[PDB]
Amino acid sequence: SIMVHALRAFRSDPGLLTNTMDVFVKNWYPRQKICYAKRKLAGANPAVITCDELLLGHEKAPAFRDYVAVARGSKDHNIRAQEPESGLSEETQVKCLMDQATDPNILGRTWEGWEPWM
């Protein structure tokens, strides 16, 4: 619920931060990642951006088909998977962003050193 109160304060006015984040005048990896930032500050889904990243050239690694099937989850029992891609309220946005972070089927296949068990 603290994230309800936090993300609402940003999502309400997407210009203020995204327009500042055009500081990357320094394709342009800036344009194509800010293209995603403008979507995710607006109503867009967290797993969708992960699929969208994996589609963005990383489709050369063989498990990309499966990486998307981990990101998209199972429509039977993952609470992200039933939602649309875009137009999400602060509730739907964060409700799903929980699921895509807490997934035991992500955590059960991931980097050591970095640490799901701590």
Curated annotation (Swiss-Prot):
Localization of this protein: Nucleus; Nucleus, Nucleolus; Cytoplasm, Cytosol
Q: Report disulfide bridges, numbered on this chain.
A: none
Question: Which residues belong to any copy of the FATC domain?
Answer: 86-118
| The protein's name in its UniProt record | DNA-dependent protein kinase catalytic subunit
Q: What does this protein do?
A: Serine/threonine-protein kinase that acts as a molecular sensor for DNA damage. Involved in DNA non-homologous end joining (NHEJ) required for double-strand break (DSB) repair and V(D)J recombination. Must be bound to DNA to express its catalytic properties. Promotes processing of hairpin DNA structures in V(D)J recombination by activation of the hairpin endonuclease artemis (DCLRE1C). Recruited by XRCC5 and XRCC6 to DNA ends and is required to (1) protect and align broken ends of DNA, thereby preventing their degradation, (2) and sequester the DSB for repair by NHEJ.
Q: How does it assemble?
A: DNA-PK is a heterotrimer of PRKDC and the Ku dimer (composed of XRCC6/Ku70 and XRCC5/Ku86). Formation of this complex may be promoted by interaction with ILF3. Component of the core long-range non-homologous end joining (NHEJ) complex (also named DNA-PK complex) composed of PRKDC, LIG4, XRCC4, XRCC6/Ku70, XRCC5/Ku86 and NHEJ1/XLF. Additional component of the NHEJ complex includes PAXX. Following autophosphorylation, PRKDC dissociates from DNA. Interacts with DNA-PKcs-interacting protein (KIP) with the region upstream the kinase domain.
* PTM comment text: Autophosphorylated at two clusters, the T2609 cluster and the S2056 cluster. Autophosphorylation induces a conformational change that leads to remodeling of the DNA-PK complex, requisite for efficient end processing and DNA repair. S-nitrosylated by GAPDH.
By sequence similarity, the record places it as follows: Belongs to the PI3/PI4-kinase family.
Q: What is the lineage of its organism?
A: Eukaryota, Metazoa, Chordata, Craniata, Vertebrata
Q: Which disease is it linked to?
A: Immunodeficiency 26 with or without neurologic abnormalities: A form of severe combined immunodeficiency characterized by reduced or absent T and B cells, recurrent candidiasis, and lower respiratory tract infections. Some patients show dysmorphic features, severe growth failure, microcephaly, seizures, and impaired neurological functions.
